[PDB]
Amino acid sequence: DTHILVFPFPSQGAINPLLQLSKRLIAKGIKVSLVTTLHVSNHLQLQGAYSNSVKIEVISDGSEDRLETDTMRQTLDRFRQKMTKNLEDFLQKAMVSSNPPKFILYASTMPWVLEVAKEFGLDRAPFYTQSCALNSINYHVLHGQLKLPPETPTISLPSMPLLRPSDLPAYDFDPASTDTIIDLLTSQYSNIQDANLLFCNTFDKLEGEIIQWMETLGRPVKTVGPTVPSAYLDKRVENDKHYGLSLFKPNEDVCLKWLDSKPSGSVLYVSYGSLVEMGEEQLKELALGIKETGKFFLWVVRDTEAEKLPPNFVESVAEKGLVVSWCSQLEVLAHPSVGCFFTHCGWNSTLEALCLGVPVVAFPQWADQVTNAKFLEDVWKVGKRVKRNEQRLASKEEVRSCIWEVMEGERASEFKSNSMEWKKWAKEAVDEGGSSDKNIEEFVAMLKQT
């Protein structure tokens, strides 16, 4: 049995892409151990019941955790110091065991793992879980060809679409942290000379020319995305309809029965994601903008955000609006009544929209979302960005008009056709003999040659 270790950044936000790739690997007969923290093991059920289930290895005791007195630099330094020792201690045992690991696939956000693997003579690769376009941007910031505030009105990087400063990641919503965050993101590319391979959560048809550019940095690049459950793509990995490793336990849902009663392609699904804390003022314009379309809509908004809705809003949209605390985003986007996704354009939501063939109204908030939104509008052409004026304030008119343009306007048919093509290509990539399948098969072959 060929045994590898997978080490995602140990946060609930960051682990799904490597768990999904792990399921593809176990389907091809690799034995996977997940290396993780006490915190992650305490919050997710990661243990499967089968012979080939991912093996969970908790390597920490929770002393690596953030303290309230920390700067982000102090938190990262402690996390790196303690988790370096924890991984060395784990490998000291694993590497002398009875079926030692032949490889460690780690989150690109933990570049220190490479130097541990180098000390032990263990083959290793980082996994870049965001777009390849962000790899180009961060690389160019590392090497001084691009700066945090663009020194130029337009940015033309090699093999990339033209970018405005407003198209570049905005890591400045946390002013004290901005330097620390840019240092972490640029450090992801500093030690790649010693990586066996670079893994990327994308597919060739989506970012082909940018993947070819990344191949010129001198290491083999393997596109293995999208990391969306098989059940929504190629359906070759039996019963995979959720992101996790354990028995899926479905919630009680109102959403799909409501959708069932609406016409095909009719309803706007709204989600600005589970981390964004939207201001009262922007929330009011968004709510009234959606209301002004007169379209059926399903808005999933968590309880601490719903508190900030205009007082009579939910009552005022009794007929057309279903405002709820939770739906399955995968089951909603896959529903035939859903015609459009009003999204913050996080990479995971971006890939889900592309995989499930749903046009977008892009409302990016922070970090890479603005770059994802630029590709969705200007490159992949599956929707439009909401126009913003008053220091990133979108008016109810700008919300309404954007929804109408994507769902009803001259380019609505174009967006739908383009969305259906990307869904086809995303399925093709992960299906037998597709670009991502071939890369995974090649990796598995390489692992068998030890």
Swiss-Prot record:
What is it used for? S.cerevisiae missing EXG1 but transformed to express S.grosvenorii optimized UGT74AC1 (UGTMG1) and UGT94-289-3 (UGTMS1-M7) cultured with mogrol and glucose accumulates mogrosides I-E, II-E, III-A and IV-A as a result of mogrol multi-glycosylation.
* Keyword NAD (UniProt): no
Keywords from UniProt, A to Z, are:
Disulfide bond, Glycosyltransferase, Transferase
| Active-site residue list | A14, A107
What SUPFAM superfamilies does the entry give? UDP-Glycosyltransferase/glycogen phosphorylase
Key word Transferase present in the record? yes
State which pathway it belongs to.
Answer: Secondary metabolite biosynthesis; terpenoid biosynthesis
How would you summarize the temperature dependence of activity? Optimum temperature is 50 degrees Celsius.
- InterPro entries registered for this protein in UniProt: UDP_glucos_trans (IPR002213), UDP_glycos_trans_CS (IPR035595)
Q: What else is known?
A: Mogrosides, the major active constituents of S.grosvenorii fruits, are a mixture of cucurbitane-type triterpenoid glycosides that have been proven to be powerful and zero-caloric sweeteners and can hence be used as a sucrose substitute for diabetic and obese patients.
Name this protein carries in UniProt: Mogroside I-E synthase
Q: Which organism is it from?
A: Siraitia grosvenorii
